[PDB]
Amino acid sequence: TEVKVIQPEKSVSVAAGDSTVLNCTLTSLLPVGPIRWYRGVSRQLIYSFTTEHFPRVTNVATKRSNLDFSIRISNVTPEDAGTYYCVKFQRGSPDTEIQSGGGTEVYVLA
């Protein structure tokens, strides 16, 4: 019954200059630990979340949005093509990766 990292799209096609969304959701925020996005597996860190939250009042959350770790790439360039993994870690000294999504490949059109 451990946490699952869900990347629903095996691939996304995007025109250069357009924006795209890489979807990732988790079934839980536990155990505490960041969610990070990598290109490749070698791999390149591109985005990171904590499971902490901003004060709720400054949001103008839901069960689903609290678990949505999707990222956007704006103004896509050919060098954005590749496979992107959403990865959940347990917090520690140091953190250890516990689960990875299945990868989403980004196809960039001219």
Binding site: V21, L45, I46, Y47, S48, F49, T50, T51, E52, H53, F54, N59, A61, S65, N66, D68, F69, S70, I71, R72, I73, S74, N75, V76
Partner: peptide, 15 residues
């Protein structure tokens, strides 16, 4: 840079 989170519930950062 050109990377952002869809949701702003959890603090997040590129890199």
């Amino acid at each position: 840079x050109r990377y952002s989170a869809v949701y702003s519930i959890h603090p997040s950062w590129c890199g």
